[PDB]
Paper text:
Here we constructed the prototype of a photo-switchable Ca2+ sensor based on GCaMP5G that can be switched with 405/488-nm light and describe its molecular mechanisms at the structural level, including the importance of the interaction of the core barrel structure of the fluorescent protein with the Ca2+ receptor moiety. In the present work we introduce the concept of rsGEIs. These sensors show photo-switching only when bound to the molecule of interest.
The reason for the almost sixfold increase in brightness of rsGCaMP1.2 and rsGCaMP1.3 compared to rsGCaMP is apparent from their crystal structures, which show a I71H-enhanced water network and a direct effect of V107T in stabilization of the ON-state chromophore. This increase in ON-state stability alters the switching kinetics only slightly. Overall this suggests that rsGCaMPs may be engineered using similar strategies as for RSFPs.
Numbering used by the authors: 38 to 145, 158 to 222, 226 to 450
């Protein structure tokens, strides 16, 4: 009904502000001392029975050769991964489709190495791992098309059963296939190092669990881009999310026309002039009405995090993409409590009629005592005439 609808709209607006206030990309910076780069990012692994397992990545890349390389200005990669199974494959395996694009530098050149990536390039991946003494090997093959930032790879566990979930190896298992836009070609360290290649090293901290340490060599061997990796994992819990295999494999890419309609309702709460784009002025208006008070610089940074075309506004399509990702990957307890606190103004753990009234009428919706109570009632599982945390979580989940 049109009170379930008022939750969705208001809920989606609050989750849009949570996304814009988070750091979900691959952040790249120059490392002049090593003639390379550093990167850091957070990867979200959905836990099968509900919840999210966070993996915090720190990364270093250094050229294998002494040729000149491109040291970038600060930017990010935005990524999109889809995992599948080959229905005719009997071995323990993963099929990976990946798109990666560079952005984060607003609107206002090309290495010799970039010429090696103008068409489709065959890829080979080899990994040797040891997690808590559980050894394994992975072999992969496929191709990369950097013109579109596109990877297709199939991986086999050559040692039998993979002792960790496949999703935990995705980031370890060729950022030289990223699409850099024309205005960012001078910031592409990865292709610039080719064909001699680069060393990629990481430490990956699985929160409340162990860590991976990785070292990889990425270079051309003949016409093939090869990724050779060693992985060491330590201090994992015997029945944690990783060694207990509790992580989801296939995350939902299935996004209904009903869900898109819900996102467009939320969009139009921000896009108050109906021109199909959200400006810093429009984002700030909504945040102030929810009781936050961002500076111009914060608003610019929030938009920059999802601003695919670098024009300084969140276009409708950029808004749909950001919302699709936000529904695909589970929020942490901390992010859900932060959304809850937008409503629970007094912090007593209960969203009251007065509290939800105060939110709704500050967001500019004219709702009288009646439909407020209709909204409370829609979410009120236990009859107390208020919305508690668990009731909030249920309202917010698709
Ligand atoms: Ca992720
Ligand atoms: Ca990090
Ligand atoms: Ca994924
Ligand atoms: Ca290219
Ligand atoms: Ca607008
Ligand atoms: Ca834009
Ligand atoms: Ca309260
Ligand atoms: Ca209740």
């Amino acid at each position: 009904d049109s009170s379930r609808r008022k939750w969705n709209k208001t809920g989606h607006a609050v989750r849009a502000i949570g996304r814009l206030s988070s750091l979900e990309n691959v952040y790249i910076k120059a490392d002049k001392q090593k003639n390379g780069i550093k990167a850091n990012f957070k990867f979200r692994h959905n836990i099968e029975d509900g919840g999210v397992q966070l993996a915090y990545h720190y990364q270093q890349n250094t050229p294998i050769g002494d040729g000149p390389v491109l040291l970038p200005d600060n930017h990010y990669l935005s990524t999109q991964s889809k995992l599948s199974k080959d229905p005719n494959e009997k071995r323990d395996h993963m099929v990976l489709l990946e798109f990666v694009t560079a952005a984060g530098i607003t609107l206002g050149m090309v290495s010799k190495g970039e010429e090696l990536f103008t068409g489709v390039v065959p890829i080979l991946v080899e990994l040797d791992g040891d997690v808590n003494g559980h050894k394994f090997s992975v072999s992969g093959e496929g191709e990369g098309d950097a013109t579109y930032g596109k990877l297709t790879l199939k991986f086999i566990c050559t040692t039998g059963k993979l002792p960790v979930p496949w999703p935990t190896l995705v980031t370890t298992l060729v950022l030289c296939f990223s699409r850099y836009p024309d205005h960012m070609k001078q910031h592409d360290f990865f292709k610039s190092a080719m064909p001699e290649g680069y060393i990629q090293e990481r430490t990956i901290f699985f929160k409340d669990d162990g860590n991976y340490k990785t070292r990889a060599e990425v270079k051309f061997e003949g016409d093939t881009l090869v990724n050779r990796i060693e992985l060491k994992g330590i201090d994992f819990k015997e029945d944690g999310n990783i060694l207990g295999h509790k992580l989801e494999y296939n995350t939902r890419d299935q996004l209904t026309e009903e869900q898109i309609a819900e996102f467009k309702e939320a969009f139009s709460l921000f896009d108050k002039d109906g021109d199909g784009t959200i400006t810093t002025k429009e984002l700030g208006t909504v945040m102030r009405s929810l009781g936050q008070n961002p500076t111009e610089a914060e608003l610019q940074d929030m938009i920059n995090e999802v601003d695919a075309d670098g024009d300084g506004t969140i276009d409708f399509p950029e808004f749909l993409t950001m919302m699709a990702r936000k529904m695909k990957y589970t929020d942490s307890e901390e992010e859900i409590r932060e959304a809850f606190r937008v409503f629970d103004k007094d912090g007593n753990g209960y969203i009251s009629a007065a509290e939800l009234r105060h939110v709704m009428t500050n967001l500019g919706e004219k709702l009288t005592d009646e439909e407020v109570d209709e909204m409370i009632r829609e979410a009120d599982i236990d009859g107390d005439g208020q919305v508690n945390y668990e009731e909030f979580v249920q309202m917010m989940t698709a």
